[PDB]
Design a protein around this ligand. Structure first.
Ligand SMILES: NC(=O)c1ccc[n+]([C@@H]2O[C@H](COP(=O)([O-])OP(=O)(O)OC[C@H]3O[C@@H](n4cnc5c(N)ncnc54)[C@H](O)[C@@H]3O)[C@@H](O)[C@H]2O)c1
Ligand SMILES: NC(=O)c1ccc[n+]([C@@H]2O[C@H](COP(=O)([O-])OP(=O)(O)OC[C@H]3O[C@@H](n4cnc5c(N)ncnc54)[C@H](O)[C@@H]3O)[C@@H](O)[C@H]2O)c1
Ligand SMILES: O=C([O-])C(=O)[O-]
Ligand SMILES: O=C([O-])C(=O)[O-]
Ligand SMILES: [Mn+2]
Ligand SMILES: [Mn+2]
Lengths: 340, 312, 337, 308
């Protein structure tokens, strides 16, 4: 059976998930420089928004240096190959924010919910489909429920109109067989035409390994970022994933050297807290803690004179979900009281 | 007292059923007239029946036809923001002087947060109760705004997934929008923001609300004492509402202002209030203080409206 | 594979990690690291220059101390783990092995390029005559097919090695390459012969490849604190142990001790960060011997070339372990062109 | 007229050497090729050239009738085999001249461009190794210009050019080459490394020489190096620099620490050689055979010239 090879969809999240690593301080020159490189490299999409999605700028998650719409408009002016993607979390961003982001240039939207809460995505997915956007469902903290339950939530977003479903390993807690389990569950219940995306985090050093396995199990889209720029120990490092994909003979359609150069020449120098696996980010992956909590826990650790790892371990015990950064100070205050 | 006015509750779900138990047990000027649902198998209707309350599963057109409707003067809407529009429409045509107390974020009537403005809209025939997050956190915003000018106020409400029924899950954008607007209008903040998060953890989590308030420079002891007075005031309605932590403060010098993109470059004081809200466990268990903070507010508003009409 | 099977954890922070610090560990550095590893209960602690016994040289870089001075310092601090060492015929000799055993080494890994196992015969025989735990170690294991690699492993077993490792010295293999090689080894070695994995992290697969090797029946895992080691480093030990622990594997070590040692003792000793970046990714993409990294960076700075251009041409030349001198040869040829 | 010789060891070195004796020797002529493996290719090459062979080792050599007139034995077996070969040959023919191509080194070292004339009267002369014959001339080229504190050589050869006899004497290779770098090259301390690479098409022999000397004039070192390359090319035309001599000044303010040897400053000279052979047995890449066998032959030839 002689058939055309599968073309992988490469979704860069350097300007959205990577916003967490720089505490949402990208300049307009930064986003233009990064988008130009990515677009030259021929990635399929460039995701742009605050790390917590549209209207994530806040005291809870940190304020952005610019608004999401300013960043989107800046990127739209520099690119001609890739589409602009954005992230929207019901409870934080709204359909009105999605309308404004579409007006600014976004054409792909990933509507993200905690893995058990996909029914809050209905109106956003239906609105995005009415706008003619590439509409994607995105399930956060995907290690928290079994593969068949996650698939049922994915099928619910499919029923709302999403044409792609992602699993996001927000806590960077999964290993390769957990990825296999989830990909098989999705493929068993979704329509054959519905795309599947992988969004791995690197907290256990398996961001690229998990992406490779996702693709071997049939996934269509892979989220990654230059130098892994992203929450916790970062996302799967895009230049690394593409180097491996290239050695495997996979049809990824991007330019490897452009990505390798952009990662170290443009993106890496913007880091002020190195995006790597270390005691703290390994603690996120081990405990299965939402990766964006990293810097907020390091800030609380320095303010209250505690160890960041002790804060993360307790957050793991508390079973917090995405968006619950206010519980980081709660845990820190409780640890101080406990120690007294 | 003895002479009470009758009420209907439309929505036999988490909020409506907790509100019915509060009317039954604690209302002084009001008494149950009917519980109205659209699902014959709804747990709330079964509960209403066991407690002797008249029920209908024929919606608001069904309520308008009960014999009891002739004597119902108040209606509490605990359905969903989209359904309130039609509910108000129908009830208003059937009985022009009926009082609607809206527990959804539709907000076709003005906002009421009792510890801040209970007396303000007592003559209005449609009053909106904001949201659970609003009722829990607007008092803390007002507590700061009565000490110092507030530039920006942000609330984060986290509730157990099991306590948020379908009605809540169909109006999440309206939750953020109505709550933000009410933080400005009632709380006194120049700009408001509201976030809602559901967490399905087991044992179910107690509602938590965190309020971040950016004001001009102010005396920290005065802000803390004002917060404490306001917590005491809300506790007269909801005993399990309490600080989980002492009020936290961060000074923001004018030499190193905080940039809120497109809003301003601010200096002064950041006040952080960490609340937890334990409910009375009338319907769901004590972790669901998110029901109580709304239902106690809605009942207090209608009770005061009734008091005013029965005793000028 | 059974999760209750006890894994053998072989730390290489004081041998492969020597490459990351350009063989400048102080004696207090090696005592502090060894003390933490021993407290954590790792099975062995490998000590030598990066290029094994008598690797100190112009070609690979001179040590701050000799191998025997480091071994003696480490011996004095430990009581649980054994001291392992590395010996490459053509660089170190049986004489050097004898001295290392007298200083305290009990495990010797005799390393050859993957196609040259027959040069290890005398070293393996000598190690078995001292009663040491004698291990064959095949470098650059991505360079030949699994069946050919297993044949070379069988040769070392035949000389007397009781454990055979595959080392992904270029950090060029992905997870299925590891399965292929494990299956080939298990098909031809005696059932009792131990198998070991020595992954490098140049493609970010150091831990992933180690996990797959264990799923495929490997007995020993080489790893190092913070990945301290050539290239983008070895499999990072604290990360491998965290994953193994989450999987319920019997790794037999203390994770907390390792995590603290990696960041409070080892990571602060790095000058050039041990991480996956353009240059170390280049090693894995081109399949170049990982210890070439700092020498290529040195040549790049001297001749004003991009390090990556030097590494990609080295990959085309198909160099093996020990060929650092060809790094300058390539730099000069790139400037000639 | 020409004196008869035996070569013991019919491998890569021994067979290459045989071809050179046949074609180039002026004072010597082949008498026998001796091995221990009847299937050895070198014994088959020898038979094709009309040379008497035996697969019965040194013992067989002596029983050979040809042995009565054999005055020179070249030993191309392996270092442990050589002490026994010397023993049995010395007993049987006291004045026989042994030219040791193995790293056994029981006789003094000879690197022709440095000391051909020195050991012409000795009955056992050792030829160091291929790495030593390629690189000792460079160490010596630096030492005649400045004091050498340390010298290190890295020899990389194709795996196909390294027979089993080479592989069984790798330790001896590093030890004898390092001692010869000192004794003949003039370095106060030597080190030698040997690497085998199986790449295909097989690789040309490469040798890199690093020399730490006292401060010196770079043009003078480079000129000395160039003269020595020319000297070696008189024997092995494919011996040459692959790169210009490279230099690094080691300042007195940041000396190099060689652990247990000392702290030195001065000049680091790096010489990058390549050695192409004449393709007498293996192809031209195997210059590691020629650098040894031409040296061995030049030594015995000079001895035979003087015997007369
Ligand atoms: N913590 C909370 O759950 C919370 C707190 C405050 C305010 N609210 C608001 O209260 C409202 C109800 O929330 P909920 O959690 O109780 O939802 P729910 O789904 O549990 O309850 C809604 C009830 O309304 C009924 N219903 C729907 N349409 C109806 C109609 N036309 N007539 C009669 N009944 C009808 C449903 O069958 C159900 O019994 C929502 O607007 C929500 O935003 C919820
Ligand atoms: N580049 C090189 O390969 C090289 C260069 C210089 C010097 N040398 C030295 O030359 C020697 C031969 O190396 P090689 O590569 O040609 O090895 P080889 O295995 O190709 O040759 C050795 C020959 O000696 C024979 N032999 C072994 N033991 C013998 C014995 N006791 N009596 C008689 N014959 C015996 C073997 O059968 C073989 O024919 C080694 O000592 C090596 O160190 C090798
Ligand atoms: O949204 C995120 O990016 C995720 O959950 O990891
Ligand atoms: O020796 C090793 O360290 C290698 O080969 O990877
Ligand atoms: Mn993410
Ligand atoms: Mn290694």
């Amino acid at each position: 059976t002689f058939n055309p090879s599968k073309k992988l969809y490469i979704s860069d999240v350097t300007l959205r998930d990577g916003s967490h690593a720089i505490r949402h301080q990208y300049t307009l020159d930064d986003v233009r420089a990064i988008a130009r490189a990515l677009d030259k490299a021929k990635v399929d999409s460039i995701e742009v928004a605050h790390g917590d999605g549209l209207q994530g700028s806040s005291f809870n998650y940190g304020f952005g240096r610019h608004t999401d719409l300013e960043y989107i408009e800046a990127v739209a002016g520099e690119i001609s190959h890739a589409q602009i993607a954005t992230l929207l979390l019901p409870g934080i961003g709204s359909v009105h924010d999605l309308k404004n982001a579409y007006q600014a240039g976004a054409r792909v939207v990933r509507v993200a919910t905690h893995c058990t809460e996909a029914d809050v995505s209905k109106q956003h997915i239906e609105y995005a489909r009415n706008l003619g956007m590439d509409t994607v469902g995105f399930l956060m903290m995907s290690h928290m429920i079994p593969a068949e339950k996650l698939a049922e939530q994915g099928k619910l977003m499919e029923s709302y109109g999403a044409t792609c479903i992602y699993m996001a390993d927000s806590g960077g807690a999964m290993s390769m067989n957990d990825i296999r389990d989830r990909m098989r569950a999705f493929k068993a219940v979704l329509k054959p035409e519905t795309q599947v995306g992988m969004h791995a985090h690197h907290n256990l050093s398996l961001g690229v390994a998990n992406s490779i396995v996702a693709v071997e199990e049939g996934c269509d889209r892979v989220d990654a970022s230059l130098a892994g720029m992203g929450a916790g120990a970062g996302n799967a490092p895009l230049e690394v994933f593409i180097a491996v994909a290239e050695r495997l003979g996979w049809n990824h359609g991007t330019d490897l050297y452009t990505l390798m150069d952009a990662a170290d020449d443009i993106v890496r120098p913007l880091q002020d807290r190195p995006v790597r696996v270390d005691r703290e980010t390994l603690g996120l992956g081990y405990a299965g803690v939402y990766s964006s909590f990293l810097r907020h826990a390091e800030i609380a650790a320095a303010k209250y004179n505690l160890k960041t790892l002790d804060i993360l371990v307790e957050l793991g015990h508390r079973r917090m979900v995405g968006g619950q950064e206010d519980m980081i100070v709660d845990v820190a205050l409780d640890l101080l009281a406990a120690h007294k | 007292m003895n002479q009470k006015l009758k009420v209907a509750i439309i929505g036999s779900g988490n909020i409506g059923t907790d509100l019915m138990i509060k009317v039954l047990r604690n209302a002084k000027y009001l008494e149950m007239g009917a519980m109205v649902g659209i699902d014959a198998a709804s747990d709330g209707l079964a509960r209403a029946q066991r407690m002797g309350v008249t029920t209908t599963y024929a919606g608001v057109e069904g309520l308008i036809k009960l014999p009891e409707f002739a004597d119902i003067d108040f209606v509490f809407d605990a359905t969903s923001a989209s359904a309130h529009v039609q509910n108000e429409a129908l009830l208003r045509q059937a009985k022009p002087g009926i009082r609607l107390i809206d527990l959804t974020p539709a907000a076709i009537g003005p906002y009421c947060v009792p510890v801040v403005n209970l007396e303000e809209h007592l003559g209005k025939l449609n009053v909106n109760m904001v949201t659970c997050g609003g009722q829990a956190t607007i008092p803390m915003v007002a507590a700061v705004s009565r000490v110092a000018k507030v530039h920006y106020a942000e609330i984060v409400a986290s509730i157990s997934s099991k306590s948020a029924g379908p009605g809540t899950r169909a109006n999440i954008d309206e939750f953020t929008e109505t709550t933000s607007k009410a933080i400005e209008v009632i709380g006194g903040a120049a700009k408001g923001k509201a976030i809602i998060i559901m967490n399905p953890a087991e044992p179910p989590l107690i509602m938590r609300d965190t309020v971040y308030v950016l004001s001009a420079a102010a005396d920290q002891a005065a802000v803390a004492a004002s917060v404490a007075e306001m917590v005491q005031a809300v506790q007269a309605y909801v005993p399990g509402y309490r600080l989980k932590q002492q009020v936290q403060f961060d000074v923001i010098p004018e030499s190193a202002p905080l940039n809120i993109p497109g809003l301003g470059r601010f200096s002064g004081l950041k006040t952080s209030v960490f609340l937890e809200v334990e409910g009375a466990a009338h319907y769901l268990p004590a972790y669901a203080g998110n029901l109580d903070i709304m239902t106690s507010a809605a009942l207090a508003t209608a009770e005061r409206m009734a008091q005013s009409m029965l005793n000028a």
